[PDB]
Amino acid sequence: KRKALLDELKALTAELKVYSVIQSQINAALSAKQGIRIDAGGIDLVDPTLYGYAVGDPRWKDSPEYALLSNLDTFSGKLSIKDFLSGSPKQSGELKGLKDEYPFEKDNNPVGNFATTVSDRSRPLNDKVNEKTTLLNDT
């Protein structure tokens, strides 16, 4: 019939889950007065720690999360946050101007501005979620 909009929402949900896990590191790092890494000096996103450990049966390999990550133009068998943010294809559009390591250097203190920048691409996802969920709630 017309299910494709739900599948777009499964994608938006997985997209937001990945951002939410990243923000869950960010808020802890800030609260611990630590910096954060987006590059090959940081973590890789194509890892079962996004939910748990090992292959918890094929459900994780089958997930819209794993599918999207393994689909990316920037995916290589591996993918950093920098490669994910500057990655494609995805519903949010791409983010430019990325660095490498964001230091908790006191004054001008920039780690919150990276969090805010990820929040900036999260706003369109809330907007798209709001409209698409509204249209779905008119289904």
């Epitope: 800030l30 101007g97 660095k99 006191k106 004054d107 001008n108 203190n109 920039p110 919150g112 501005n113 805010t116 920048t117 900036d120 706003r123 369109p124």
Partner: antibody, heavy 127, light 111 residues
Framework: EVQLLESGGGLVQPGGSLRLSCAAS????????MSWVRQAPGKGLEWVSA????????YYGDSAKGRFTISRDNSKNTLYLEMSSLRADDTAVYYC????????????????????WGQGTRVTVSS | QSVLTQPPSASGAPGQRVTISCSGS????????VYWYQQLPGTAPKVLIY???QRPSGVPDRISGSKSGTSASLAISGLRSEDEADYYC???????????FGPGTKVTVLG
């Protein structure tokens, strides 16, 4: 001397469009986020767009139906706004500013208040 | 909640001291350390102060920034022609409160 410098401004025509732009000098502006603001005769200042153009829908305010938005290039140390489908009222003066001063979080939303400003230019519906 | 006001309305001869001050509340003021705006006639608005009381790479520390509980404040010494201005104690937004950028305040060096 350390300063910003603008380009684009002067005169415009109804239903058309035109660009304003801002460039940094004397500092390595490099990656710092940027926000846009308006002035008019006999008043201080107001918002035009926050951070990036994300606080900058093609419909003004939180809504008012006017087609204005932005682009960004701190690698060029310079950034841009476009103006389209004009009212008479879009006739005004405009400025841009960078983030800087922030520590210990303290504000716990956005930032402790923003920190440096451009020189700006007139815009007029020349019909 | 609507808590800032912009009242001080001062003027004084060249070189004098002046005290300049604005209201507020502890949801807000405790979260900041001082920054305000100055505007000469025929100009775009400009920087005043940072790092609790420090003035720009171009002007001396003639100014002290300050605050206390439900209020925010400033004072100046050795006042000059470039201090002929409208002054704004603002926070770069309109938001929900009655004052968040506000009217400014005319201040004059009485030459």
């Amino acid at each position: 001397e350390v300063q910003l410098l603008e380009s684009g401004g002067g005169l415009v025509q109804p239903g058309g469009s035109l660009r304003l732009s801002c460039a940094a000098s004397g500092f390595s502006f490099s990656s710092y986020a940027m926000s846009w603001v308006r002035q008019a005769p006999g008043k201080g200042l107001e918002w035009v767009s926050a951070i990036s153009g994300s606080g900058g829908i093609t419909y003004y305010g939180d809504s008012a139906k006017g087609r204005f938005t932005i682009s960004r290039d701190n690698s060029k140390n310079t950034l841009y706004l476009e103006m389209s489908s004009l009212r008479a009222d879009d006739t005004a003066v405009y400025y841009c500013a960078q983030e800087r001063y922030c520590d210990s979080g303290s504000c716990y939303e956005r930032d402790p208040v923003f920190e440096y400003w451009g020189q700006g230019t007139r815009v007029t519906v020349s019909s | 909640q609507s808590v800032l006001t912009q009242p001080p309305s001062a003027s004084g001869a060249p070189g004098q001291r002046v005290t300049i001050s604005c209201s507020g509340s502890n949801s807000n003021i405790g979260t900041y350390f001082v920054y305000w705006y100055q505007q000469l006639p025929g100009t775009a608005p400009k920087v005043l102060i940072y790092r609790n009381d420090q003035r720009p790479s171009g002007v001396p520390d003639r100014i002290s920034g300050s605050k206390s509980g439900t209020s925010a404040s400033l004072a100046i010494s050795g006042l000059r022609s470039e201090d002929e201005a409208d002054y704004y104690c603002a926070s770069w937004d309109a938001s929900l409160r009655g004052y968040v950028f506000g009217p400014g305040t005319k201040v004059t060096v009485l030459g």
